[PDB]
Design a protein around this ligand. Structure first.
Ligand SMILES: [Zn+2]
Ligand SMILES: [Zn+2]
Length: 140
């Protein structure tokens, strides 16, 4: 746990970020970013390779497989959906929201999200400008 309440989803997510930052998904990054040691991140990656979420191409840079980009895009939609909820509705301070949504993202349901895509006034960008991926594939 530890706010990284779901490693599998965190790894996948962090790559969505590295790609969104316009940077290279180097294991050095995911290890530092998540406070995991290299020997374990590769342990996790190989594991996630054996699960069909990622693929280690020539670049050696971990790549999101259709399943990985799938379980990555949704967690980012949940993440961002909660960010709106916390700011717009709950009113948590704008700077505390991220670390909050960073957790709730692993526990929010598609059923809840839809209610949010509805109840919430603007499900286009999360508070920090970021786009809300998956909307179409959510069912809204
Ligand atoms: Zn955030
Ligand atoms: Zn998280």
């Amino acid at each position: 746990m530890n706010e990284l309440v779901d490693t599998t989803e965190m790894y996948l997510r962090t790559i969505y970020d590295l790609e969104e930052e316009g940077v290279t998904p180097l294991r050095a990054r995911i290890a530092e970013r998540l406070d995991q040691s290299g020997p374990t991140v590769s342990q996790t990656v190989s594991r996630m390779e054996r699960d069909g979420l990622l693929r280690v191409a020539g670049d050696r840079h971990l790549e999101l497989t259709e399943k990985g980009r799938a379980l990555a895009i949704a967690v980012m939609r949940k993440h961002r959906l909660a960010e709106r909820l916390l700011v717009d509705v709950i009113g948590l301070p704008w700077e505390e929201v991220h670390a909050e949504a960073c957790r709730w993202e692993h526990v929010m349901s598609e059923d809840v999200e839809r209610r949010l895509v509805k109840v919430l006034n603007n499900p286009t960008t999360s508070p920090f400008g970021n786009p809300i991926p998956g909307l179409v594939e959510l069912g809204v």
